[model samples]
Target: MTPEAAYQNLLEFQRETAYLASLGALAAWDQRTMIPKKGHEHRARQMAALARLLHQRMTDPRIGEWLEKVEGSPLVQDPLSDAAVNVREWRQAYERARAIPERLAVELAQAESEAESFWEEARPRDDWRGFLPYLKRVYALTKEKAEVLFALPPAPGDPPYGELYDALLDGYEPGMRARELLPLFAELKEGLKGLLDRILGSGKRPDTSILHRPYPVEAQRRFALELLSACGYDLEAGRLDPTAHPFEIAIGPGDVRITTRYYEDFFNAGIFGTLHEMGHALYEQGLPKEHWGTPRGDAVSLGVHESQSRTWENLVGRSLGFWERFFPRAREVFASLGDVSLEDFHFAVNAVEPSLIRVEADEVTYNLHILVRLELELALFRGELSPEDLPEAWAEKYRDHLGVAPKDYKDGVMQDVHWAGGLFGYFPTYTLGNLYAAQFFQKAEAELGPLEPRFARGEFQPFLDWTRARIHAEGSRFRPRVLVERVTGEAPSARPFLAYLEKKYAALY
Candidate 1:
């Protein structure tokens, strides 16, 4: 067969599969936000059936034949060509999917679905015991799949995965290894320790009462929508809803959606969470339209995806410049802030606290939370820790690292939905996103000049356009690490992030 024909066949197959997968995404989104309690049982089966079908399509032998025909052909001779990018990704995905049995895939789908549902019910009740059995099954199946991927020969552009967990990580952040992250995270941890010491030891504290004041939930929603629109989230193509947790999901090209929880007594949760999801939504909305349903149109990795979120949530959203414009609007909406000053409010939002909850953690203490999770995840898969023992170990890690401990199971190991939903090797991306956000922002400032002034004037288009061109438009044409280096002209490291944190917090303290 001609190379062109082979490439076309692969494209057609991928487009159909992508459309079907988007249906699953829509169902998953609905399950999280709108589904009834009684609907979970049926939802799990429906999800499992879809997983089986998608797995079959993903692992079809014809994909392999098509990939082989076009891989070395002239059509893909340029490694950066559209055909080359799609072929490379298709080969990696086909090989990985083919390594796992269809039954295991279907079982994991059902297991993850049921476990997440149980977690949603169990967390609010602080019922770790009730959730333990399901958590164990998810881990067990995840290990089985990871081991299979570990045994397979490494794909092109992939470093040989030397550990079982490394295989799972590569699925989310391609070509990254546990060993590579070890020293990086260690450096970040040490830097964070010193920074936390200086900030808390300074005896200076922001009057955080302003945030905890009585802000109406309806007013919070109103303020968040205004910010979301002003930040370029394109509401015409999207919708915002409330959920137990915040997330941004793409149902397809034109139907991206996001969720956030509102707190009548706390200010940052809804506003900052909305900004975080908006960052993710903007990336989804900015992906090249011409390459939809192909690798070139997909966001590169979870780490990079997190970078966009963190950039918006922390860098842009938390900046004094952003509040400069929004604080008035906020005061107009919520009388709680009527007497507050912007200086105190900004300081409160950026306050460095070694907190129990990961999501609510400040930028400095946030990586510490991820460190605890990554260490615990490594130990769990290394056969040193079990699901039953996770809580004590969790508290222990928090005590050792953050100098704080959770008061109950609800706030401790069960705080996140990742483990319950079978997302191992995913926690590290949060910190990676922070690192990438700092690096990208540093580069962005060099080119676009200081963003705070623009933000204070309520001008965000320059930064948005810069990222949309540099990061979003490229899509999966580059890997996360490669993309960072290409855009920032620097190797990926913890230094830029550490420096950013030190400078930001030193002035605040």
Candidate 2:
């Protein structure tokens, strides 16, 4: 077939795949939000069916054949051009998909749906024994998938386990590997450890009693809705629901939804988490609709996606200037915050308290949480740690890194929803998000000076527009590092993130 014919065939193929993919997204979202406790077996079967369909579509011999015809044409000579970029990503996807068996993909889908619902039972009391069997099954299947993908061409020179982790890492963020990540992780740990120590030793603290007071769940949701709307989470295109964990999903361009967890005693999760998921939802809403059915419409990477969330949750939401605009209404919503001074409230929100929980950790110590998880996951993939022994691993990391320990797995290794769904090589992206958010925000500031006043007046559209033009519209056409460099003058770096933390915490402490 001609190159035009080849591109049309590939486009139709992805369109069909995208339509089916949206159903799977809805199924996963339903399971997370409203599926019955005992109905997971059926949901697993449903997910498996969809996985088989996607696997078959992705590995079709026609796609592999058509891509070859499209790539060698004179029209695709420039490596950075659109056709060149599409071929680059489609090649990666097709090659990786063809490498794994259809049955293993189904097994992974089934295991994820099954493991996650069971993991939820353990969350209530941190019953590691109750959840360990399911987790073991998840890790085993994920390990099997990694081994198969590593067997494909251009293998890295790393050791057995290092290469295995890298193989899995390729799924979420292509071209990233353990060797590249380790040095970045090292820099983050060194800088974060020093900053955390300084902030804690400063001995000055906020009147955090205002934060821990009873802020009712309903009021929190109402407040979340209002602020999310101000930041451009389209109510017509979106819905926010309650869940055991917080997440955002895009079932379609016109249909996006997010979830948040609430705590009546503490306002942190309801407020910051809503802002975090808002970032994810906004990216979904901002993607180029013209490329909706293929790789060009998807998020560049989990790291890039997380960058959006972290930018809103911490860089914008937690900033004093943001509160300088919105806190007046926040007090009216919670009633409990009515009497607290603006300085005290801002101080409480940014307070550098090292805690046992990763999701709840302050800006200064959050990356340390990701740092420890990366180390442990590296060991687990390396055959050095057992799924059953994660409880002790969790306790030790907390003590070593955060200066606090949890007696139960509820606040320990069992806390996250990522591994339950067989998501490995994904946690490192949280720290990557912090780095990308800083670099991206700094670029935005340089391009348009002092965004604080806009944020102060409850105007967030300029920041939103900057991101849409630079980040969201580009989609998966560029590699994450390339995208960062194209937007910012430099590549992704810890320098900006560390500097942001130093400046933010210096003022608070």
Candidate 3:
């Protein structure tokens, strides 16, 4: 076939494949939000079937033939052209998929799907023993998949971290490496620990009791929607729901969804979580519609995606400026805050403390939580720790890093949904997101003037527009590291994030 015809066929085929993938996305979203408890077993099989089909389509030999024809064509001469970008991603994906056995792919899907409900049930009961078998199964499959990819020849521009887990990390954050992340995380941990020490020594604590006051669930829901709308999350194209662990999912272009949980007594969980997910939703909604089936319409990486969420959640949502604009409204909606002052509320929201839950941990201690998980994940994959050893290992790390440890597995090793769902290399990206968010926010302020005043004045569009163009709109046109450097004009580093944390907590304490 002619090169032109081959490229068109490739595009159309990938689009149809992506259409099928979107159905799976819908199922996964429902599994989290609306799927009935009894449906778990059937859902596992259904997910496995879809995974098998997707693997088949992705590894189809015709894609390789198309790539061969198109790679040398004039249509792809411009490296950043849509055809070139999509072809590059398609080739990379095809190679990776082709490297893995189809049976393993389907089994991994089924195991992960089955493990989720097991994790959910096991967590609340602190039943690590009951969940250990499932965790082991998932981890074993993940290790097998990683080993397969690690043995495959590295694609052009793939950053080699020189380990089996690097292969999985690359799948999430293309071109990222553990070798690069280790030093950055080390520096960040030291800086955060020092900052935490100073905050604790200051003996100046916000009355966090303010947040624990009764925040009616319905009011929090309404207020969350308001913040989401104000932050430019298109209500027409996206939505908010409740889930055990909050997340954002994109079914396809113009159909992004987010889930957030609520507690009647806690103020920060639902509202901030909604803002966090809204950050993700806005990015999804901002991706170019015309490139929906291709890399140009997809997120750059997990790190970049988390950067969007953290930016909105902490940088914007927890900002004094944001609360300055919304505090009065908050008081009106929930009379609990009517007697409270803005200064108290802001401090309470940004309160620095070591906590058991990573989701609820203060900014200063948050990356420490990630460090614990990353080290534990490395240990698990490296044979230093086993599934049975996780609870003890988890506690040790938490105690060493944050001076806190869980007495039960539910609040300890079983807390995060990632491991049970076979997301082994995902923890590091949370720290990466924080670093990226700080650097991007620093640069954004330099270019857009001060955003605090704008936020206080209830004008969030300028910042949204800026990110839409610089980060979201660019999509996967650039790798995560390149995108960060391009946007901020600085290589990825922990210094910016550490500095941001140091400055923020210094003033607060």
* Candidate that would win on lDDT: 1
* TM-scores, all models, native as reference: 0.97, 0.94, 0.97
305 Cα displacement, candidate 2 (Å): 0.4
lDDT of 2 by residue, 1-509 (tens): 79878977887887889899899999989988999998877887787778777888988899988898887886468866666667767877788788877777777777776788788787887588878888888899999988888776542222343478888886777667788788887887788889888877897788878888999999899889999889988989999999977999999988889999999999888889899999998998999887887777878888899999999998999998899998999878878987888899999988887887788788888888888888889889898998777878878877887778888778888788899989999888888888999999999999989988889998899899999999999988777888899999897778898888888888888
Looking at model 1, residue 484 earns an lDDT score of 96
Candidate 3 residue pairs in backbone clash:
none
Say which prediction, candidate 2 or candidate 3, comes out ahead on TM-score. Answer: 3
lDDT of 3 by residue, 396-425 (tens): 999999998998888888888899899989
lDDT of each: 0.91, 0.85, 0.89
Residue 22's lDDT within candidate 1 is 89
By summed lDDT, the worst window of 10 consecutive residues in model 2 runs over: 153-162
Taking all chains together, the TM-score of candidate 2 against the true structure is: 0.94
